[PDB]
Design a binder for this molecule. Structure first.
Ligand code: HEM
Length: 446
């Protein structure tokens, strides 16, 4: 049975606060760190149960996760069953056709021992909690770096920096979530280590945790906007409307959240807002060949690359349940300033903004790493298409800094190719393990 009282809340629910801080730390004097981990952190770690009840959301929601080197600093030599986690993300960078030479230097190594995720409706409240932690831990905790993040303002609340509504699609955990139309339904052990049908044996104290893949993904927003205007397909509407269509073709949803598979030529903001309808699709359409039809959604669209649905078989009618083991829970939040007047006018980025990307999964090789390397970065994925060369994911697809060839985006001609510069630039990140709450004051403090 899924013991949600013992699972950290960001994993299955998300913090859902206006402001978040990712506080990346090293451990000194581990015996002292441990005493404070047990006395000061464990009691204020927010659980799934706590966050699932709108009446027990804490003022400051706190989660904590440890890198491989952080667990080792705590004297934990156990095999958590994940080679990617053990090796650290810097060693995995070439899997994604990037180089750590481009990373924030603190990520390009294994000095980071963990991350504290703090979330609250104001930054003052976060800062007070950080000050309390630094006060009680003293020098046994050392801040290496941090990243502040926020829900975007006004009509962009819940949208990422390019302007698209985010956080729509997640796997439903069988026995825990009430599935929405079209939502994949997966065994708990796809996300939670040691939960139902996790095939990898874990240390006993690690049952109820998850691996957290963090990526600091800069977004080149003025450049993206200008690209869409410059490449907008011909049509009856305003130039901006035609540019908007191209952007929707790249993501697989309109900015409103409406999936293009269900509304391929025009936005439907009412559909985008409706969780009962906005995920209710499989990419299959009766009367169309799944292997060649890109009129509803390109084969290269971001969401189609990252959850293939009927492209990997299974039910043609919703819900499609394919590739459940390749599911990830996403808890990303935007970072950086909004686009400034001068950046928009010059079509040029000056300040860094983007997505503080967070993915949870029980097996890094099946989740984030797989989606990036085997799907998004693979010009021949999905398989069995005509033309066979789908191209790269236009949002996240990487090829060692080169422009990406992306096919199928133009509704007028599915064979038309575009060469697209990166609009998302990796600054690196790390793989962490978010332990069950019991382990925080338990094994990890022993
Ligand atoms: C700055 C970088 C990124 C941006 C701007 C971005 C944006 C989006 C947007 C707008 C959606 C549609 C909203 C939704 O369906 O919930 C989405 C969905 C999704 N993204 Fe990305 N994303 C980024 C990075 C990533 C990465 C690195 C991965 C994995 C390697 C990823 C995996 C997914 C998945 C699995 C979905 C849901 C697909 C589905 O279930 O249909 N995203 N993203």
């Amino acid at each position: 049975s899924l013991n949600t009282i013992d699972i950290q809340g960001d994993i299955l629910v998300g913090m859902h606060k206006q402001k978040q801080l990712f506080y990346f730390f090293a451990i000194n004097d581990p015996a002292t760190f441990k005493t404070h981990l047990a006395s000061d952190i464990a009691p204020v770690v927010a659980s799934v149960t706590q966050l699932s009840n709108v009446a027990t959301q804490p003022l400051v929601a706190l989660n904590i996760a440890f890198s491989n080197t952080g667990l080792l600093a705590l004297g934990v030599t156990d095999n958590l069953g994940d080679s990617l986690f053990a090796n650290g993300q810097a060693k995995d960078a070439t899997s994604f056709k990037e180089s750590t030479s481009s990373w924030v230097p603190q990520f390009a190594g294994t000095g980071i021992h963990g991350v504290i995720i703090l979330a609250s409706d104001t930054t003052d409240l976060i800062d007070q909690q950080v000050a309390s932690i630094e006060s009680t831990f003293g020098s046994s905790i050392s801040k290496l770096s941090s990243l502040s993040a926020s829900i975007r303002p006004g009509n962009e609340a819940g949208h990422e920096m390019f302007g698209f509504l985010d956080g729509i699609a997640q796997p439903a955990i069988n026995g825990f979530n009430t599935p929405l139309p079209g939502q994949n339904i997966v065994d708990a052990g796809v996300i939670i280590t040691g939960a139902t049908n996790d095939p990898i044996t874990r240390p006993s104290w690690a049952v109820g945790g998850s691996f957290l893949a963090f990526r600091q993904l800069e977004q080149l927003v003025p450049e993206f906007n200008k690209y869409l205007l410059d490449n907008a397909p011909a049509g009856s509407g305003s130039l901006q409307a035609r540019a908007d269509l191209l952007g929707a073709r790249m993501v697989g949803r309109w900015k409103s959240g409406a999936p293009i598979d269900l509304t391929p030529t025009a936005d439907d903001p009412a559909l985008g807002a409706d969780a009962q309808r906005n995920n209710n699709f499989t990419y299959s359409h009766a009367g169309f060949d799944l292997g060649s039809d890109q009129s509803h959604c390109p084969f290269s669209a971001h969401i189609r690359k990252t959850r293939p649905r009927a492209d990997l078989g299974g039910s043609l009618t919703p819900p499609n349940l394919s590739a459940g083991a390749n599911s990830i829970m996403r808890s990303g939040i935007p970072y950086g300033p909004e686009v400034t007047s001068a950046e928009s006018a010059s079509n040029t980025t000056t300040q860094e903004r983007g997505l503080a990307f967070v993915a949870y999964q029980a097996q890094l090789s099946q989740g984030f790493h797989f989606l990036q390397q085997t799907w998004a970065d693979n010009a021949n994925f999905p398989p069995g298409k005509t033309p066979a060369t789908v191209g790269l994911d236009p949002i996240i697809g990487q090829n060692n800094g080169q422009p990406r060839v992306v096919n199928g985006l133009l509704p007028s001609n599915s064979s038309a190719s575009l060469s697209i510069p990166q609009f998302v630039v990796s600054h690196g990140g790390e793989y962490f393990f978010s332990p069950p709450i019991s382990a925080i004051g338990g094994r990890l403090s022993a």
